[PDB]
């Protein structure tokens, strides 16, 4: 990203600053704190590396054609995956509460959330839904 208004550049006028931002160096301490930017470049580099390692044995290995070489030598999953869905949503709900200096009524409401959660979870427990015989 490059700034497009002097207000975004804190009302600092001139052409030097525009070009400076255009070809700036990435710096967490510069203009891009908490940028997440290296993730994308890491993705590009890893894509390149993995593609190269895929390609290379197709170059430095002899090949022979065989017919037989080209051949290979439940609801419990439903239960687990759907429970994971719901419980991960609940964990996402819980996460902001752990990131704040919550108060006592906030604590009690959080406990109410957890109480409903564990009520459903324990009902599933007591009915044999957590026994993975099937």
């Amino acid at each position: 990203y490059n700034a497009w208004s002097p207000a975004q550049r804190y009302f600092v006028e001139g052409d030097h600053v525009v070009t400076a931002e255009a070809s700036r160096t990435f710096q967490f301490t510069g203009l891009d704190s908490g940028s997440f930017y290296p993730y994308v470049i890491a993705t590009v580099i890893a894509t390149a590396i993995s593609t190269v390692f895929i390609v290379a044995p197709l170059v430095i290995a002899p090949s022979r054609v065989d017919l037989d070489k080209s051949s290979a030598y439940s609801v419990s999953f439903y239960l687990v995956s759907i429970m994971y869905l719901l419980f991960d949503i609940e964990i996402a709900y819980l996460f902001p509460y752990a990131m704040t200096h919550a108060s006592l009524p906030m604590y009690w409401t959080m406990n109410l959330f957890l109480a409903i959660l564990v009520a459903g979870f324990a009902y599933e427990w007591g009915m044999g839904a957590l026994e993975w015989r099937e």
Binding site: V59, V65, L67, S70
Partner: protein, 262 residues
């Protein structure tokens, strides 16, 4: 099939067979000298490999009177140099060039027929000192072969293009003027050469009155279909669920077609 900085067409196709025939005649105990060439070999061809092949055949004949010359056409097989490169050109590539109209006529043949032919040639004495041409029971053009291949691969997108020969040469010109001073590279089709273009401008079938499989009492099996077509079908594994094709509804089981109501 391609020239190299360490080996030229003449070196492989003329001098070595000539010296081999000379040493064979020097041995005195050799009874049969079997040499191989192409059906498209002719001394008046623009293709350098075909011309070298014909010259080497003539040299072998002069050196060894009783050597038997075999000139088969396109030979098909699991690891052949005919269908495999055609697959590498139809697939794994953006577009497939085709020389001119591509209506030139060729007579592809099967390798096991060639092996039984060698056995019969060793069995028959009269074939010594002669030339035998090998070809299939059918005559087809490059366009027809490409269409049947696309049917075999069931590809719904014709990626082949009919182009003038000079355009194809200019496409292959830069990599053919650098063919020398190079130790050779892998994954190079023999098709990207001007000699191939010259091959595609002439018919390559058995000459009228030539000695063929019938002279050996041999019936050439079908190359378009049969057991020789199973290996190329394993590119499409024979076809269970591959591709999007619907025209294949001919061979689909009964109840499935009433399920899809055609």
């Amino acid at each position: 099939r391609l020239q190299t900085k360490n080996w030229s067409f003449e070196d492989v196709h003329v001098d070595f067979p000539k010296r081999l025939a000379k040493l064979a005649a020097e041995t005195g105990q050799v009874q049969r000298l079997i040499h191989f060439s192409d059906m498209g070999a002719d001394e008046n061809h623009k293709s350098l490999r075909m011309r070298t092949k014909a010259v080497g055949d003539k040299e072998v004949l002069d050196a060894f009177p009783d050597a038997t010359i075999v000139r088969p056409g396109d030979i098909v097989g699991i690891e052949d140099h005919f269908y495999n490169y055609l697959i590498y050109q139809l697939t794994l590539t953006v577009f497939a060039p085709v020389v001119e109209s591509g209506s030139n006529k060729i007579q592809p043949t099967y390798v096991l027929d060639v092996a039984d032919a060698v056995a019969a040639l060793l069995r028959k004495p009269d074939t010594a000192g002669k030339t035998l041409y090998l070809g299939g029971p059918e005559v087809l053009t490059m366009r027809e072969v490409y269409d049947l291949l696309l049917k075999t691969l069931r590809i719904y997108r014709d990626d082949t293009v009919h182009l003038p020969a000079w355009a194809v040469k200019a496409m292959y010109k830069p990599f053919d003027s650098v063919r020398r001073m190079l130790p050779g590279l892998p994954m190079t089709s023999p098709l990207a050469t001007e000699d191939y273009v010259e091959e595609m401008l002439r018919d390559k079938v058995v000459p009228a009155g030539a000695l063929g499989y019938a002279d050996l009492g041999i019936v050439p099996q079908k190359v378009t279909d049969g057991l020789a077509i199973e290996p190329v079908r394993h590119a499409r594994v024979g076809g269970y669920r591959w591709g999007d094709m619907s025209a294949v509804a001919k061979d689909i089981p009964e109840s499935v077609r009433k399920y899809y109501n055609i």
